[PDB]
A paper describes a structure:
Tyrosyl-DNA phosphodiesterase 2 (TDP2) {also known as TRAF and TNF receptor-associated gene (TTRAP) or ETS1-associated protein II (EAPII) } is a 5′-tyrosyl DNA phosphodiesterase that can remove the covalently-attached abortive complexes generated by DNA topoisomerase II (TOP2) when it is unable to complete its normal catalytic cycle. Fortunately, this type of DNA lesion is efficiently repaired, in part though the action of TDP2, which hydrolyses the phosphotyrosyl bond in a magnesium cofactor-dependent reaction, leaving ligatable 5′-phosphate moieties. Consequently, TDP2 has attracted interest as a target for small molecule inhibitors that might have utility in overcoming innate or acquired resistance to TOP2 poisons. Using a ‘humanized’ mouse TDP2 expression construct, we have now determined X-ray crystal structures of the catalytic domain of TDP2 in complex with deazaflavin inhibitors, revealing the unusual molecular interactions underpinning their mode of action.
As with the apo-hTDP2CAT crystals, co-crystals with 163 presented severe problems with anisotropy during data collection. Again, multiple crystals were screened before a dataset that could be truncated isotropically, to a maximum resolution of 3.4 Å, was obtained. Despite the low-resolution, which prevents detailed characterization of specific protein-drug interactions, clear difference electron density maps identified the binding site and general pose of this class of inhibitor bound to TDP2. The experimentally determined binding-mode of 163 is surprisingly different from that predicted by molecular docking studies, in which the pyrimido-dione ring of the tricyclic core, was hypothesized to bind to the magnesium cofactor–required for catalytic activity of TDP2–and made few (if any) hydrogen bonds directly to the protein. Instead, our data indicate that the tricyclic deazaflavin core of 163 unexpectedly packs against an extended hydrophobic patch, formed by the side chains of Trp297, Thr299, Leu305, Ile307, Cys311, Leu313 and Phe315, which lies at the mouth of the channel leading to the active site, more than 9 Å from the catalytic Mg2+ ion bound by the carboxyl side chains of Asp122 and Glu152. Significantly, the M7-motif maps to the binding site we observe for 163 in hTDP2CAT, where human TDP2 residues Cys311 and Leu313, along with Ala309, coalesce to form a ‘hydrophobic-shelf’ on which the deazaflavin core of 163 sits. Replacement of Cys311 and Leu313 in hTDP2 with the equivalent residues Tyr321 and His323 in mTDP2 disrupts this hydrophobic-shelf and explains the resistance of the mouse enzyme to the deazaflavin-based inhibitors.
Author numbering: 112 to 251, 257 to 321, 327 to 357
Amino acid sequence: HMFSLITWNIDGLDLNNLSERARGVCSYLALYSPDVIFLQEVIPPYYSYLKKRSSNYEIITGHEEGYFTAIMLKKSRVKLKSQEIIPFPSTKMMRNLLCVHVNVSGNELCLMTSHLESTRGHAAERMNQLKMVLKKMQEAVIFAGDTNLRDREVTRSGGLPNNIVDVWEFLGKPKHCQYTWDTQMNSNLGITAACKLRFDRIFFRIIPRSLDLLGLEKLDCGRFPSDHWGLLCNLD
Ligand SMILES: N#Cc1ccc2cc3c(=O)[nH]c(=O)nc-3n(-c3cccc(-c4nnn[nH]4)c3)c2c1
């Protein structure tokens, strides 16, 4: 029938004006009203707002302390079958892989999210994190989350497998959503340098329809909802 999802690193560690940014993030989720949501970098206070505002979603957290990922499932349409938190081994940043087995319209496709290593120097540790993601996908599939991948690190990690495709590259490599982390346009960072990267990615095992950016409008306090852009992929 139809399907949608939203990946967004809400940047929950950035405590400044977070009460207003979280009211903007919710306002984006309310108008679009997706079926599945993949959030990264969520602090316990941030999880408290989404629990009270978005009352029609069954949230599954990846941890409890620090920051963690989160999956929100449209309770009216998506049914919970299973849920599991597979942690990364040699992770030095309190990071894990969050998978949830659901059933939408009678179809068996699981949902995954993660927040791979943020460190740029810890590239091999991130690439080893990438390999365990693709190895778990083939073992169950729609992955989505802050990957922090760049500079052909997917190539040097052995490349993507045949059964796993990237929704961006699969849609003819569209240009409007080429970069989810844009230090040029997004000025929540004050970075005088200009770099653009595609961090938030979406891997597929249903056919993806569209892909678009979220949170491009500055709020009333002059700051964006997040340093990352929100991703939105429709399907059928
Ligand atoms: N401020 C700033 C600032 C300006 C410019 C760049 C440019 C790049 C680039 O062309 N490729 C790349 O892969 N990463 C870049 N980072 C980056 C982004 C996140 C993290 C770390 C990082 N973490 N640890 N060391 N470096 C670097 C930048 C950061």
